Amino acid sequence: SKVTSKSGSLGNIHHKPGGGQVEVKSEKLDFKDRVQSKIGSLDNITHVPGGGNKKIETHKLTFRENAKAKTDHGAEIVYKSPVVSGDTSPRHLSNVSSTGSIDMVDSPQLATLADEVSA
Amino acid sequence: SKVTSKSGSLGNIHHKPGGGQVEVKSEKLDFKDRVQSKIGSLDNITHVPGGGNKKIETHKLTFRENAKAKTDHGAEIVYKSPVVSGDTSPRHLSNVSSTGSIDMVDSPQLATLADEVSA
Amino acid sequence: SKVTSKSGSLGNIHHKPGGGQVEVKSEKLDFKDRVQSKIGSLDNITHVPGGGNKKIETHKLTFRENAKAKTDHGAEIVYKSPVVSGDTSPRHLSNVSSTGSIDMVDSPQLATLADEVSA
C-alpha cells in the first residue's frame, strides 16, 4: 500500500573491513606543503536527502531616462558602466560530497594600475 | 498505507573493523605546512535531511532620471558605475560534506595603485 | 498498490575487504606541493537523493530612453558598457561527488593596465 514521492531510501549498510593488513616502511616520511595522506584509513560519506527542494532566483531591472534635449553642445561619456539585471563576474564552485580537496583561488600578479578622469 | 513525500530514510548502519592491522615504521616522521594524515583511522559523515526546502532570492531595481536639459555646454562622465540589480563580483563556494580540505583564497600581488579625478 | 515516483532507492550495501594486503617499502617518502596519497585506504560516497527538485532563474531588463533631441552639436560615447539581462562573464564549476581534487583558479600575469577619460 506504499506511496513514495520525491524521496531517497537506502535500506541497510554493512561494513566488515576486519582482517585487512597495511604496512609502510621508510627511513623518513617527509610531507611538505598541502599533502593529504591516507594509510589504511576509511573515509565515508552517505547522503540521503529528501527531494522536492526549490531554488528561486529573480533579477528585475527597469531603467528609464526622460529628457527633452540631452548633451546640447556637451560631452557625455559612459565608461565600463553596464546595465545588467544579473550578477557581474560571479564565480560559483558547487560540490556535494568530497573526500579530497576543493580550492577556489584568485591570485593576480599585477605590477601597476592607474585610473584617470580629467574633465 | 504508508505515504512518504520529500523524505530521506536510511534503515540500519552496521560497522565491524575488528582484527584490522595498519603499521608505519620510520626513523623520522616530518610533516610540515598544512599536511593532513590519516593512519588506520575512520572519518565518517551520514547526512539524512528532510526535503521540501526553499531558497528564494530576489533583486529589484527601478532606476529613473527625469531631466529638462542635461549637461548643457558641460561634461558628464559616468565611470565604472554600473546599474546592476544582482551581486557585484560575488564568490560562492558550496559543499555539503567534506572529510578533506576546503579553501577559498584571495592573494593578489599588487605593487602600486592610483585613482585620480581632476575636474 | 505500491507506487514510487521521482525517488531514489538503493537496497542493501555489503562490503568485505578482509584478508587484503598492501605494502610500501622505501628509504624515503618525499611528498611536496599538493600531493594526494592513498595507500591501502578506502573512500566511499553514496548519494541517494529524492528527485522532483526545481531551479528557477529569471532575468528581466526593460531599458528605455525618451528624447526629442540627443547630442545636438555634442559628443556621446558609450564605452564597454552593455545592456545585458543576464550575468556578465560568469564562471560556474558544478560537481556532485569527488574523491579527487576540484579547483577553480584565476592567475593573470599582467605588468600594466591604464584607464583614461579626458572630456
Author numbering:
A (entry chain A), B (entry chain B), C (entry chain C): 316 to 434
Sentences from the paper on this structure:
The assembly of tau into amyloid filaments is a hallmark of Alzheimer's disease (AD) and other tauopathies. Cryo‐EM revealed the existence of disease‐specific tau folds, which are challenging to replicate in vitro. We studied three full‐length recombinant 0N3R tau forms (the wild‐type and the C322A and C322S variants) using an RT‐QuIC assay with brain homogenate seeding.
C322S tau yielded structurally distinct filaments with an ordered C‐terminal region. Both mutants seeded further aggregation, whereas the wild‐type showed poor reproducibility and mainly unfolded aggregates.
